[PDB]
Design a protein around this ligand. Structure first.
Ligand SMILES: [Cl-]
Ligand SMILES: [Cl-]
Ligand SMILES: [Zn+2]
Ligand SMILES: [Zn+2]
Lengths: 30, 21, 30, 21, 30, 30, 21, 21, 30, 21, 30, 21
């Protein structure tokens, strides 16, 4: 695949793509 | 965390799987 | 605010807007 | 759950807020 | 909720979320 | 340009692209 | 209206342009 | 206007409701 | 990665994430 | 094709990768 | 219509809007 | 190419049709 900058809503869209049914957490404070 | 790894720096789709449940 | 009908990635977009820097967890059923 | 509710019926922003960290 | 920077298509996506059936106007010239 | 089939937030995205800095009004039925 | 037309049938970019300010 | 309030500066979901019809 | 159910613009978003700087071709049937 | 498959059934990221340049 | 900056996923969303059934190519390397 | 024309610079919807098949 590739490596790119993924930020904000684009980052969570990518998490949704990659994780899907597994679910995910988005925790920017860390 | 994720913002540093993937937004500030650059990450792969494989690294994104680190944040799946 | 109005009620929402949100499927797929659109739910994740809404969570992103609602939660902001707090982040969120996305946990679909099986 | 919330994911299914928002899609099969409707949900509010206030219900969504419960999923914030 | 939270306060964040919302620009461009992200701003109108947020207006759609917040306003929905009410409708909205996006008038960047002011 | 081609004809469009646009629901929900996708209509708002199209309006955004079409109108640009002119902005637009989103006015759904009831 | 346009919102319903684009979703239940189809619409053109030219029809959309009517909703610009 | 909205761009100044929400893009250039920072706004809440409540302030966004200012631009609803 | 998980399997995907992608329609409309969501397919193009996925292709964008998958291909990155390589780019891609979008070729629907008729 | 892929466009129809991803929408009417399901598809994988690996199948999508075939459409990269 | 208008002229604006279209980048990344926003650029491919615009290609999808403009091209639709014709299909398109996104080839950022050129 | 497209990035230079439409992202770095500024392009119309008509110019975007240059990249249709
Ligand atoms: Cl959809
Ligand atoms: Cl952006
Ligand atoms: Zn969608
Ligand atoms: Zn963006």
């Amino acid at each position: 695949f590739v490596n790119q900058h993924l930020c904000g809503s684009h980052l969570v869209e990518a998490l949704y793509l990659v994780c899907g049914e597994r679910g995910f957490f988005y925790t920017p404070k860390t | 965390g994720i913002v540093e790894q993937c937004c500030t720096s650059i990450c792969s789709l494989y690294q994104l799987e680190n944040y799946c449940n």
